[PDB]
Write a structure and sequence with these properties.
nucleotide-binding, cell division, globular, binds calcium ion, septation, GTP binding, Rossmann fold, alpha/beta, binds guanosine-5'-diphosphate
Length: 306
């Protein structure tokens, strides 16, 4: 069994994320670009493109009206089903607050789930400087997304203001937001690709991610003294995420290391997760020994059940 992973960008922000991921290089993942904006879709690098709402917009964006994105997606339902068909997992990514993302992304998520895919949303909330109407349409979209998906990761754009200095280029800040999706996707590809010593597979991802609500995905890398504890802390850190580790009741944790990976280190990492949660966590634990590695340890966490 080799699970089919698809990433679907919906609207401007969603498609920017897809474009920056394709640009960065990513294999065994199919990308789908969905938009009302024909100008933007023409410049997309995605292998499969769906223009929605040509009747409604005549190839322009939806102009900040979420009912137009919704109706656009509904009328292109069969084209969307066809593009998804055969996926085992779908990541739907979108910026909430606009017309197309806000309205179309939950429809896409709903179609994905009813095609049988494990469906994860990764969405942004607008910057506060964008104003209250934007924030309020965004919140309606987030609730709609939450209803449609299996699990939802929310990245408030205001959090980007916590990781920049006064000169950090906007595109560099956006790339940091993109990493949440990219590394979440990559960590699932990696789990599926490798047969670990204590193996985790797609059915374990399904157990943790299916019909939950909020989620956290994370990866942390470290080496040398305290590598396991530091990799675990990095894995659970959530500066850009609305949903932190606290209150997590289920965690999929994988530790990858060289032949030096110690049992003691494995427990240290697991206990960082347990203790940061402040709940009695139901852990799905895995380990991979990759003899090509020297002193590096990688800890992967997916946490749900808040
Ligand atoms: N982090 C991030 N946020 C974005 C990006 N593009 C747009 N946004 C945000 O997403 C919201 C909706 O924008 P957009 O997706 O272009 O609207 P739509 O195409 O009408 O859905 C904006 O109000 C911004 O908060 C991006 O590339 N990165
Ligand atoms: Ca595996």
């Amino acid at each position: 069994h080799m699970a089919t992973l698809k990433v679907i960008g919906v609207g401007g922000g969603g498609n920017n994320a897809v474009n920056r991921m394709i640009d960065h290089g990513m294999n065994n993942v199919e990308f789908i670009a969905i938009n009302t904006d024909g100008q933007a879709l023409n410049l997309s690098k995605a292998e499969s493109k769906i223009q929605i709402g040509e009747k409604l917009t005549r190839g322009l964006g939806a102009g900040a009206n979420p009912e137009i994105g919704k109706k656009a997606a509904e009328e292109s339902r069969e084209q969307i089903e066809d593009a998804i068909q055969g996926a085992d997992m779908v990541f739907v990514t979108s910026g909430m607050g606009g017309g197309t993302g806000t309205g179309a992304a939950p429809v896409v998520a709903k179609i994905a789930k009813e095609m049988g895919a494990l469906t994860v949303g990764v969405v942004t909330r607008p910057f506060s400087f964008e104003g209250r109407k934007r924030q309020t349409q965004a919140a309606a979209g987030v609730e709609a997304m939450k209803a449609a998906v299996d699990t939802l990761i929310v990245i408030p754009n205001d959090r980007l203001l916590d990781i920049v200095d006064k000169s950090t280029p906007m595109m560099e800040a956006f790339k940091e937001a993109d990493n949440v999706l990219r590394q979440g996707v990559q960590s699932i590809s990696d789990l599926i690709a490798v047969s670990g010593e204590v193996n985790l597979d797609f059915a374990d991802v399904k157990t943790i991610m299916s019909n939950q609500g909020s989620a956290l995905m994370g990866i942390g890398v470290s080496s040398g003294e305290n590598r396991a504890v530091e990799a675990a802390k990095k894995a659970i850190s959530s500066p850009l995420l609305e949903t932190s580790i606290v209150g997590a009741q289920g965690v999929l944790m994988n530790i990858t290391g060289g032949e030096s990976l110690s049992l003691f280190e494995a427990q240290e990492a697991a206990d960082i997760v347990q203790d940061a949660a402040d709940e009695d966590v139901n852990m799905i634990f895995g380990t991979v020994i990759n003899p090509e590695l020297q002193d590096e340890i990688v800890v992967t966490v997916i946490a749900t059940g808040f």
